[PDB]
Amino acid sequence: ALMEEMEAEHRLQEQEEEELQSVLEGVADAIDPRWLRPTPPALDPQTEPLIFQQLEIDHYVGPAQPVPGGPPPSRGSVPVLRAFGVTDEGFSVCCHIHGFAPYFYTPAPPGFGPEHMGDLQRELNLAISRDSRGGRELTGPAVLAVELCSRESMFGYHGHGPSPFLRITVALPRLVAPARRLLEQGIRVAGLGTPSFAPYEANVDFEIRFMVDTDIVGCNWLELPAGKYALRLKEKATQCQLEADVLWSDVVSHPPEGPWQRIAPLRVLSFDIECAGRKGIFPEPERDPVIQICSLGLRWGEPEPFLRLALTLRPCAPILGAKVQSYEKEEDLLQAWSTFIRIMDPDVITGYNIQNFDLPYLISRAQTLKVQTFPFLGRVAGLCSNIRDSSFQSKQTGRRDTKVVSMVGRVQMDMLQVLLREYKLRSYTLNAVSFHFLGEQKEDVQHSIITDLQNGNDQTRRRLAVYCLKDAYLPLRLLERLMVLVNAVEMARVTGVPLSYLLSRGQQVKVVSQLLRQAMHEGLLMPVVKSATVIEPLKGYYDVPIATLDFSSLYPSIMMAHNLCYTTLLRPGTAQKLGLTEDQFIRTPTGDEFVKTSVRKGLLPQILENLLSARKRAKAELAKETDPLRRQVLDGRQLALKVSANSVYGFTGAQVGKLPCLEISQSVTGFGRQMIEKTKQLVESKYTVENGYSTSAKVVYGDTDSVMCRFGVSSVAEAMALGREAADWVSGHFPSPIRLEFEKVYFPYLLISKKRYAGLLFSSRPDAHDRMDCKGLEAVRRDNCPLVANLVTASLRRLLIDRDPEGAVAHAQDVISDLLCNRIDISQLVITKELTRAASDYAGKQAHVELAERMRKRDPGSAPSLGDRVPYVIISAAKGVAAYMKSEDPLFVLEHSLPIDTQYYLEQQLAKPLLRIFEPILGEGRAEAVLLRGDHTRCKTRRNCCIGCRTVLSHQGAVCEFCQPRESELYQKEVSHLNALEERFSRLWTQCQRCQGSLHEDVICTSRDCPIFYMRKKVRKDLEDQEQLLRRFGPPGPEAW
Amino acid sequence: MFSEQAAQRAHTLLSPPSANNATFARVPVATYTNSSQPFRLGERSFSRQYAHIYATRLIQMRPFLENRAQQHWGSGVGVKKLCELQPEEKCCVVGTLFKAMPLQPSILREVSEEHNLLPQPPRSKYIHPDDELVLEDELQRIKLKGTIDVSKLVTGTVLAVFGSVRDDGKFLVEDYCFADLAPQKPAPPLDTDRFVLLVSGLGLGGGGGESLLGTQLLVDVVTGQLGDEGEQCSAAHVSRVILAGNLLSHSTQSAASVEAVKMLDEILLQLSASVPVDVMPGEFDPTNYTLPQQPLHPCMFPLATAYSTLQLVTNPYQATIDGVRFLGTSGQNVSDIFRYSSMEDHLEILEWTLRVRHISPTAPDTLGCYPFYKTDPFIFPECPHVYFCGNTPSFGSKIIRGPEDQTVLLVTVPDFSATQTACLVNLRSLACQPISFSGFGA
Amino acid sequence: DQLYLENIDEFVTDQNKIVTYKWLSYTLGVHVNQAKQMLYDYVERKRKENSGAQLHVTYLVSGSLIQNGHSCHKVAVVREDKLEAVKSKLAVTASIHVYSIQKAMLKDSGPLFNTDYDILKSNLQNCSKFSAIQCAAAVPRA
Amino acid sequence: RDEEEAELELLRQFDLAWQYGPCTGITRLQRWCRAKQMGLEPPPEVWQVLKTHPGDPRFQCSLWHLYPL
Ligand code: SF4
Ligand SMILES: [Zn+2]
């Protein structure tokens, strides 16, 4: 039920955005030369055109303007479109487009004639004026035009040809929603009675409608011809260098195919802040000041940032390779940063978690300190930034409640949002992301330490500034590594939506845009409507090669094959009346009838064919290009094409959407089942020992686009040859583009269950492997301790590479025995949970809430605040105590040497995954006894006392008289242990120094997710204890001579 | 020499039994003074970070290197700290080196989720063509480039580099110099020949028949059991014996050390009854794994400790014998440098460590060391007359002189378990002579 | 002085022991050089009158040598057939004397080490009482 | 309170000074004596303050003493 409420919330958000978006009442109002954008040259708008790449498009309402050769110089509330972008040389360009108004369609009621048209208009003009609903905000006419055209609905196959339709064009965008609703209620028209009009395309954004009508795709190049526009010389409403006014019928768009595929030199600014809050309390905007602000600006294309900057409160020591400014009072710091943001004028803004914590905090602090000119960040003069609240919730990516900051003219790309919406990870913290993606684990610092460093001397503040600069620079490294911007530009070019819409609205807008673009050619409207047989596997350990056959885009290929589309649907019981012949249509297994291409070709097959052709061209051109930039662009293009092709079906089959239809989904699933069954039967039929082949091949795994078969051969080369021959033979009988291709071969195959398999990857070399492949992540939940993942990986490696099940069993036994004897390090058993919800928001009490409360009662300074991640381990406690009462901070356990509840870890972390993995190998039930029911599964086992006899000693010697002759043997048993610790110590602390990046400076890394943090303290305590123990023996000799 | 002094007395053992027999006396040690006090630590504490042992080191070397600059590039160059530099300005900077390498082992990789990650077995030199050098003083880091050898130098070296900061942020280097030798007080001369025997790496517990026979022959020669009258008379002048590290075998560390220790105790009982013995613990000996290794506990030697000639000392054995100063180690620093540098000859490595005025320059970055805070005792206060390190595959000896009229003898003592060779050091002419034992086998 | 001669004769023939010099020195309680002279006398006088005497006398050779440009000192134990070559190779000869006598020919040197080690362990308290070098500083402490 | 607060601030500034070396794991008196041994001439006021408040962990302990570095 999440989809319906998400749709309702998005509709409410859109309706709120439409209201008061008219920025006509919203308007209420020491420089380094490197910052300035390059100086524009002398341009004459009568001989040369204007060429630029546009990034974002939006609209505002205001009085009309005297565009040459266009609309009259009026003042009516007509929409005005704005396009911000970059020229070739780097000049920011802001363009104003006039004279475009929204419109929609209605069907023609019976008996309608042209003479009524104008009368109808009058009545509609009477409606909004009479109807107080709509905010009671109107100036003049409500309907600009009523026209009659010839269109046919895209839903179903009527076969009666095009029919008359009424196109209604209204002055304002926000007036589309009210009048449309009235058209459902019927309108009293003299002679015609009170007919009703069904809405058509009445829920399409104004910007998308303009992009479809004028054929402009997102992030594509635009040309304004010479002599067709006007250049503003005075009263520039925006802060850009060039403002041009041009009518909407002269803007020429160049599609991005070939020489117009380049990317203009964009500017990207990554920024971050550092604040000095109170001890033990999460930073707040009212009282906690902002001390440091760091920024890095980069021209897109260059391999290095072109501007570094770090503004710090109080005097700071100089930095080599950047610039440092010292401001006495925080108000000057904030205003200076605002002036820097205005003058540099970046076109992409990023950082890490800047949408939720950075900008709202800065704006709140600016409001509190009474700095009036800080909020003006947008390219529109006199536009105060407004903080709004919103949320995005899904059962897979969780729930996010975030603030949103409005900045007109700039595109924000918060890396946290991109990672959330395009990846799944155990932890989304910056340190974990950096370690996972780049292999470097960064340093963590407490807030109390930062506060102490703030009151220090100049060098300490310089160190803080360096840390902030590194933290702000890391997201730029991530952006360059993942090439997020290039993929975003490719998606905006392919799907025909602006760059910003990719981070604020769902998947349906892209498919809606593509459908409208394709349908406009044939004159087909879009009516608005309201909302298997998997092959049975055989779990086990196949020690023979297994061949993999893959279907290339099974669902889109099936849709292209049999002419499955919205326009090709047949109403039941209609073929007989229409006189259709039995050889024109096909009958899907679910009981739907579809006409072949001999009558009409649907929209979806054409779209998918165009996408496949584009992908083929991209693949062909990839093999010849040598420039890395164009290679990246082509890779992004092909990836976007593949993703859009896959997502077409995801749009079509949704139960809740803008155009649901379950018949297509049922037919596609039925065809998939039938084709899988046919493939299985044919593969069984062909490879038989009867036809002279060595062994009888059979299919052991099958689901959607994956068939894993056993051919009974033991040589990888023969396996690949037979797989390719089988692929060709099977694909020689599947009609239409639907094809099956060889993929790879796993020699050691471990089949746990459905969607759970592992093996060794052979792709190119039949003799040399590539890696260890494994689906069914299993150990992926963040609440699972890393011990489970480590054990699973070790077992898989031993089973696949070593091919020794006995070795894997022995390793598992050793790990379990070590766990049951308090030998495993605490760092492996740490479970971290985030305080996502408030304490009162939990239906029942949980462990981390109680742990946080107890830590706060102990010491507020180290107590984590709400929203942070608290770690805990399950300590041993008495029976009858509540389950949530067993959690404890790991450091407290280390200090007090508290016992660890081993039974909970044994029967709640390793039992289920190990059982699932080893059931196919050792059999069901027996594997449980082998693993965790047996002797190894049990492994049974202040004054000075003799180590040997374990008796109370009257003296303080190492041993009593009874154990004297063995004393020597004890010594070699002790020092050899101490040595084994000392080396480890020497390999820990120095390591942290390498992690710190400096030798002479101190180490202040207190990260709680780095195992070295716990290990070093444990080693230090053990060293002290061992030295105290060894002092009981005699001293080695004199030390004072 | 040994042969010349041994051949003086005529052979008498190839004759029927005679009534009389010769009997010499051990040469008593005229003077001796153990001065291992900085290397002997009392109550040991491990509640500090390593940063201390770096910072003090720098502040203990700055007054030296500057003087050296005045003797190389004249008095026209003034030492300028990193934060006071300006681009394209020729200047001298004093600081430590950090060698970034990709092959340096990391605990984090071996302990993280990677675990196996196709584990790399231990191997030889970890040097890589992609290693980089970063100069660092107490405040800032700066990458180096120019006429500087990346592979030869190692981490922990303290040097003064002459050059300038280029526009890209790196430091162009024209010439570098080292601290060179310390001031030295000339040793008093002697009157008669005296010998000091150096042995290393007995390797007890290995079971090798030839190695055991060689050890037996060495024990008999030193104590005067074996040899004609001339040989016994010439060996009667050996005034001391030093056993430097690696006493046990590789497989005696976990164990079965309860037999190797008994064998070592019997050998030390044999030696201590005829000649003073000084034992230095090694890497494989039962002691802690810091660089200053405290002496072996006397409880492990019930028999040998009954005498007073036997003595157990710290790892760097800074001593004074007959007015001649000796300084030695167990060979860990040389091995670490050889594993983290492109140098091959061990004698060259020893001389290089002598010319940086530091016993273990790589410590504590790759070699475990106690975290001192008061002073770093590794720096030479006075240049020793004899510098030796045991456990090297090839015996070596070399006499060198400093720029200020010094005279140092470097000796690399061969691993006796493999080559079966020991060294005789003269104390009058400061000459080194190898001596090897071997047994037949077929 | 035929008493020790007959004792050694019975040690080698009947009991078939491996008679080194330290073993004989500890058994008869005499000075080491006198033991070596006794062994040499026995070896020389055996061959004149006995046509057999399947001995395998092993000598010790020591001296100076040139190795890797160094004036190395060599001490080695060699059999009765390789003596001439080792004499030729060494520039200066310092010590040459009888070392070991045993009737059964030895493939390697293991038995000598085992015998000497066993008799050494049997008499630890007087390890260096019969040596040719005696020190006055090393006095045992109770 | 004013004298004690000023003395605490002075001791904290002494701890955070960069020209004497690190300040972790060693008491302030030891650090001051080490600084004097090398001729750096550390301030005498810090030594007097340390000597006039003996045994109180708020003075002898270093700045990062409480935190588990
Ligand atoms: S000091 Fe060690 S534990 Fe802390 S962040 Fe660095 S590598 Fe991780
Ligand atoms: Zn006891």
Side-chain angles (χ1 to χ4, degrees), chain A residues 431 441-444 988-989 991-996 1003-1014 1016, chain B residues 108:
Chain A
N431 198 352
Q441 188 170 14
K442 88 156 192 171
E443 179 180 357
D444 186 13
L988 290 190
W989 283 93
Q991 164 62 26
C992 270
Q993 289 178 339
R994 309 171 193 171
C995 196
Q996 173 186 335
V1003 192
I1004 54 181
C1005 181
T1006 61
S1007 176
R1008 299 220 169 184
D1009 45 11
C1010 182
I1012 303 180
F1013 173 80
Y1014 309 102
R1016 62 192 194 186
Chain B
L108 183 56

Side-chain angles (χ1 to χ4, degrees), chain A residues 165-185:
Chain A
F165 273 89
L166 307 178
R167 167 168 53 184
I168 300 177
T169 304
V170 300
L172 284 173
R174 63 183 180 180
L175 292 179
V176 163
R180 148 216 177 186
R181 183 185 58 182
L182 299 183
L183 286 175
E184 281 192 353
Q185 300 179 354

Side-chain angles (χ1 to χ4, degrees), chain C residues 45-97:
Chain C
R45 275 208 269 257
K46 180 65 174 187
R47 297 178 184 179
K48 298 189 308 174
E49 62 177 5
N50 187 262
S51 59
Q54 309 290 149
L55 294 172
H56 293 280
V57 181
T58 52
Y59 282 82
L60 174 88
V61 182
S62 62
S64 60
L65 196 61
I66 304 175
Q67 294 175 350
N68 295 332
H70 270 294
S71 173
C72 172
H73 182 42
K74 256 291 186 176
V75 181
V77 193
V78 293
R79 278 182 276 198
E80 207 180 3
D81 68 332
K82 302 179 181 178
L83 178 67
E84 309 307 318
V86 186
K87 279 184 183 179
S88 63
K89 293 177 183 176
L90 296 188
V92 188
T93 287
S95 302
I96 285 187
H97 60 71

Side-chain angles (χ1 to χ4, degrees), chain A residues 740-1011:
Chain A
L740 175 71
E741 293 184 355
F742 189 96
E743 185 174 2
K744 48 203 177 181
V745 152
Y746 301 149
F747 179 28
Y749 187 69
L750 174 57
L751 182 57
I752 297 176
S753 71
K754 303 185 180 183
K755 309 175 182 180
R756 293 177 184 177
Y757 52 86
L760 190 65
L761 181 53
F762 292 102
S763 64
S764 60
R765 303 179 180 180
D767 54 333
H769 76 274
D770 296 332
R771 65 178 183 181
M772 171 171 56
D773 185 15
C774 51
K775 218 66 58 58
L777 296 175
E778 288 271 1
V780 74
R781 304 90 197 265
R782 56 186 55 170
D783 297 2
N784 303 25
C785 59
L787 179 64
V788 184
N790 299 330
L791 181 55
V792 167
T793 299
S795 300
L796 284 188
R797 197 206 180 192
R798 274 188 169 85
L799 289 168
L800 296 185
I801 294 181
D802 304 334
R803 308 179 183 180
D804 183 13
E806 310 170 5
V809 170
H811 180 58
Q813 294 174 351
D814 293 328
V815 170
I816 292 182
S817 183
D818 295 4
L819 176 60
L820 293 179
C821 295
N822 293 324
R823 296 182 179 178
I824 303 300
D825 188 299
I826 180 179
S827 61
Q828 310 290 346
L829 317 177
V830 176
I831 300 180
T832 60
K833 288 190 173 182
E834 181 186 1
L835 298 177
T836 59
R837 298 182 179 181
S840 59
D841 304 357
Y842 292 102
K845 298 182 179 181
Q846 297 181 357
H848 44 243
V849 181
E850 304 291 339
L851 175 58
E853 291 183 356
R854 292 192 310 276
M855 290 179 61
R856 190 165 302 176
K857 293 178 181 179
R858 290 173 177 174
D859 190 8
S862 58
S865 59
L866 184 62
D868 298 326
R869 289 198 169 190
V870 189
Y872 71 95
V873 298
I874 302 303
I875 69 177
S876 181
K879 300 179 181 179
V881 187
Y884 43 84
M885 291 299 302
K886 296 181 180 179
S887 56
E888 190 63 29
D889 188 298
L891 282 182
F892 189 82
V893 176
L894 291 177
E895 292 180 18
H896 290 262
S897 300
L898 302 180
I900 296 183
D901 203 9
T902 58
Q903 187 70 17
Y904 179 87
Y905 272 85
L906 174 58
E907 287 199 11
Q908 297 304 322
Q909 296 302 317
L910 295 182
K912 305 175 182 178
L914 287 188
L915 276 188
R916 288 182 180 179
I917 291 183
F918 281 84
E919 270 176 352
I921 300 184
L922 285 176
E924 305 171 357
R926 177 179 179 177
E928 177 184 359
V930 174
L931 289 182
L932 41 85
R933 186 146 49 94
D935 57 335
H936 103 268
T937 81
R938 291 178 283 97
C939 278
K940 309 303 282 79
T941 68
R942 172 183 176 180
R943 292 187 177 183
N944 301 14
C945 299
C946 170
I947 307 182
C949 55
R950 278 194 177 182
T951 60
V952 182
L953 299 180
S954 61
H955 51 38
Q956 303 179 6
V959 300
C960 58
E961 284 192 357
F962 197 88
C963 308
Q964 163 62 30
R966 275 185 58 259
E967 175 175 350
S968 165
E969 212 290 325
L970 283 185
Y971 196 99
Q972 313 168 47
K973 197 183 186 65
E974 300 289 348
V975 53
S976 177
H977 176 69
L978 165 63
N979 196 285
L981 292 182
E982 287 276 354
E983 159 191 353
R984 195 179 186 185
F985 179 87
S986 294
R987 300 175 65 177
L988 290 190
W989 283 93
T990 69
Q991 164 62 26
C992 270
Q993 289 178 339
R994 309 171 193 171
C995 196
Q996 173 186 335
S998 189
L999 302 179
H1000 304 264
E1001 307 166 13
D1002 263 325
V1003 192
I1004 54 181
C1005 181
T1006 61
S1007 176
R1008 299 220 169 184
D1009 45 11
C1010 182

Side-chain angles (χ1 to χ4, degrees), chain A residues 690-711:
Chain A
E690 306 182 9
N691 298 335
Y693 279 80
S694 59
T695 52
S696 298
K698 202 169 184 176
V699 176
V700 299
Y701 190 59
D703 53 322
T704 325
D705 51 359
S706 185
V707 188
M708 292 183 174
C709 310
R710 181 188 53 171
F711 284 90

Side-chain angles (χ1 to χ4, degrees), chain A residues 37 52-60 81-87 91-97 219-220 222 237-243 266 345 347 378-381 383 407-411:
Chain A
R37 283 173 165 262
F52 61 88
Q53 165 192 358
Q54 56 91 359
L55 295 180
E56 191 182 15
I57 307 178
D58 60 334
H59 85 285
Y60 78 95
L81 285 169
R82 287 180 300 192
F84 306 100
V86 183
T87 8
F91 325 140
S92 71
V93 176
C94 166
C95 170
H96 290 349
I97 303 176
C219 303
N220 95 304
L222 303 182
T238 58
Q239 313 285 11
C240 288
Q241 291 163 331
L242 300 185
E243 287 201 18
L266 301 179
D345 189 63
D347 287 314
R379 268 171 166 166
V380 182
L383 179 65
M407 307 176 62
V408 169
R410 307 173 215 280
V411 184

